Amino acid sequence: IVFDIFNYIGIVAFAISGAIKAVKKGMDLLGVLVLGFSTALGGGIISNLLLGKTPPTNLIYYPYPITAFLASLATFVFYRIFTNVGKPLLYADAIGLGAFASSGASLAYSVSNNVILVVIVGAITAVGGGVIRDILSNEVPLILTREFYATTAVIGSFVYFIASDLSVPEDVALIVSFLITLILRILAMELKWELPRKKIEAA
Amino acid sequence: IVFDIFNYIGIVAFAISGAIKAVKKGMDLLGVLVLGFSTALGGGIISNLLLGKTPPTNLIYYPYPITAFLASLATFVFYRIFTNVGKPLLYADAIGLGAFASSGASLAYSVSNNVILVVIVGAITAVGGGVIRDILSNEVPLILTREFYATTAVIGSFVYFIASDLSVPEDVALIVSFLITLILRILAMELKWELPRKKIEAA
Amino acid sequence: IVFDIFNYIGIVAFAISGAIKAVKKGMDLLGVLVLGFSTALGGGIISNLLLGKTPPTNLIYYPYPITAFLASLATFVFYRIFTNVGKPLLYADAIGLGAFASSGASLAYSVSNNVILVVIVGAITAVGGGVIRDILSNEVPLILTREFYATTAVIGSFVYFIASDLSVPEDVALIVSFLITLILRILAMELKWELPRKKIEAA
Numbered sequence: 001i002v003f004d005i006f007n008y009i010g011i012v013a014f015a016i017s018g019a020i021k022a023v024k025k026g027m028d029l030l031g032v033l034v035l036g037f038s039t040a041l042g043g044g045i046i047s048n049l050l051l052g053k054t055p056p057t058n059l060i061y062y063p064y065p066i067t068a069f070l071a072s073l074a075t076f077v078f079y080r081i082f083t084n085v086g087k088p089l090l091y092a093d094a095i096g097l098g099a100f101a102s103s104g105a106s107l108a109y110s111v112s113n114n115v116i117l118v119v120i121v122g123a124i125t126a127v128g129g130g131v132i133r134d135i136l137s138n139e140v141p142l143i144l145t146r147e148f149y150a151t152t153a154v155i156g157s158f159v160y161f162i163a164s165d166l167s168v169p170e171d172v173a174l175i176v177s178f179l180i181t182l183i184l185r186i187l188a189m190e191l192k193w194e195l196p197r198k199k200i201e202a203a
Numbered sequence: 204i205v206f207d208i209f210n211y212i213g214i215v216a217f218a219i220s221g222a223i224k225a226v227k228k229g230m231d232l233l234g235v236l237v238l239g240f241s242t243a244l245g246g247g248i249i250s251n252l253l254l255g256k257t258p259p260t261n262l263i264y265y266p267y268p269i270t271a272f273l274a275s276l277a278t279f280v281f282y283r284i285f286t287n288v289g290k291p292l293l294y295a296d297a298i299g300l301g302a303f304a305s306s307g308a309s310l311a312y313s314v315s316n317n318v319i320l321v322v323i324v325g326a327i328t329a330v331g332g333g334v335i336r337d338i339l340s341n342e343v344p345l346i347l348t349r350e351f352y353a354t355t356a357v358i359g360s361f362v363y364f365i366a367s368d369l370s371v372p373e374d375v376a377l378i379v380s381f382l383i384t385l386i387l388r389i390l391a392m393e394l395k396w397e398l399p400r401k402k403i404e405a406a
Numbered sequence: 407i408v409f410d411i412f413n414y415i416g417i418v419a420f421a422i423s424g425a426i427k428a429v430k431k432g433m434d435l436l437g438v439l440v441l442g443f444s445t446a447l448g449g450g451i452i453s454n455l456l457l458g459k460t461p462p463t464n465l466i467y468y469p470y471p472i473t474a475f476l477a478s479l480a481t482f483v484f485y486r487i488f489t490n491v492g493k494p495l496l497y498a499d500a501i502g503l504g505a506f507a508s509s510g511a512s513l514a515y516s517v518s519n520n521v522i523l524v525v526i527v528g529a530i531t532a533v534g535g536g537v538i539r540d541i542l543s544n545e546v547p548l549i550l551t552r553e554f555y556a557t558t559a560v561i562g563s564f565v566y567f568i569a570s571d572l573s574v575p576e577d578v579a580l581i582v583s584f585l586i587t588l589i590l591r592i593l594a595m596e597l598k599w600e601l602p603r604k605k606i607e608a609a
Contacts, residue, residue, distance in 0.1 A: 052460030054255030257458030
């Protein structure tokens with residue numbers, strides 16, 4: 001019924017996180033807002049396009065862009081208090097990651113019963129916004145470099161596909177998908193999990 | 204009837220401006236052309252996708268891409284004369300900003316009577332092309348950093364929505380929207396208007 | 407009948423080439439995979455969106471993303487042997503360039519009998535993936551700067567349009583388009599062809 005709470009925590013947490021980056025980058029108030037809006041809602045917009053769902057929910061359904069704008073605006077005005085809440089924002093981010101991977105995997109599944117589309121599009125909904133943020137910041141996106149965000153959303157999206165394939169009801173599929181994303185994200189944060197690199201000595 | 208003049212001034216002015224950036228970046232003739240084409244027509248292509256309008260006008264309606272290609276090509280061949288016409292190109296740019304914000308707000312409105320979609324999509328039509336240009340240039344897009352472009356196109360798009368909502372006829376809605384964008388852009392250029400930043404002392 | 411061989415050589419060659427860049431950039435295993443996947447399949451995804459073809463083939467038709475993932479994964483595990491096969495990968499790349507320009511020009515043509523759409527969208531299918539790769543790498547895309555990739559795919563796409571316009575049958579149109587792309591690419595590699603730049607002395 002009210003999975004909106006997890007979504008709204010995600011929109012707020014992702015907007016704050018994007019807005020903080022924008023400030024640290026030196027962007028003016030519009031950039032802070034655009035950075036926050038993209039981090040929280042750009043994944044969803046990309047997936048709508050990939051799936052042919054026009055116009056995109058996050059530009060149409062008033063409370064989502066309203067929330068992201070206010071959350072970004074509040075991070076700007078009160079940036080002194082917001083930038084010192086390190087551990088709580090990390091956990092809220094993990095909540096948004098799990099809500100967004102589940103949601104987008106759900107939307108992809110309703111378009112095709114296809115494991116590749118569902119895993120990729122679920123993962124784009126969760127981490128696509130931060131990729132936009134990082135390209136707008138003139139940086140190599142974080143998910144290509146370090147941490148363990150996108151991998152967890154990949155595994156979460158795949159869990160949703162398997163549940164639905166095994167005829168698990170939708171809402172149960174969402175919760176389990178959300179909860180496994182959240183477990184793997186917390187293991188990764190605390191254990192400092194990383195994917196392997198190639199170490200090449202330079203001549 | 205012939206609002207095409209404002210559109211065509213915009214395509215030419217935006218192509219020249221994008222083409223100039225490409226030259227200053229060191230791009231070869233193809234990049235100059237791509238930079239000019241994107242600055243003038245990429246906003247429109249992005250909005251077509253957001254609105255589900257396929258294939259995009261700016262890749263279909265011959266005179267628009269023809270104009271942008273020739274304008275970019277002419278900036279390359281005659282880059283000595285074109286790069287010293289500073290103030291006139293700024294004002295032509297302001298004309299394109301007002302024509303493009305109006306047009307795209309119009310197209311968005313005909314898809315949904317929705318203030319958020321119309322304001323954002325109108326603004327993407329006007330400044331989306333320059334964002335592409337700047338990402339292709341490996342830079343943080345200008346609108347996130349300085350000046351007052353995107354804000355003026357936001358206000359212009361919102362004026363178009365309010366006019367249409369109050370039952371103002373379409374063509375009148377376009378002109379008033381275009382003219383207010385143009386007023387705010389000129390105030391901003393001459394008064395050097397900027398949005399606020401956060402100044403954080405580094406330790 | 408089996409033009410799949412040329413396509414599959416392209417997917418493998420473009421995935422290896424993208425995966426190599428990712429390693430040289432310092433990306434972790436996910437980034438290597440994303441870099442390879444984008445270089446081989448992102449052009450096609452962009453063209454599907456431009457043409458309204460949803461969901462995109464390269465996220466739906468299992469062997470294409472499977473091939474790109476395995477090709478990228480194999481470049482990572484065995485990066486010692488793969489990075490010393492310089493001349494053969496260049497020629498395989500030229501094969502993918504010709505297959506991808508032909509394919510996408512074909513898809514664009516079936517949507518509109520329009521020379522501008524077909525040339526641009528054909529060219530995006532062939533070089534669009536490498537543009538994504540380069541933006542993800544925080545670089546100015548190669549095609550704006552040097553070499554002769556995109557121009558050859560432009561000429562190849564235009565040859566496909568002219569053939570089809572002159573009532574040449576489809577499969578014959580594909581082969582001739584593919585072969586002329588491949589001729590121009592090889593001339594360009596060996597003769598070191600480049601487009602002109604503007605040389606401006608700095609004061």
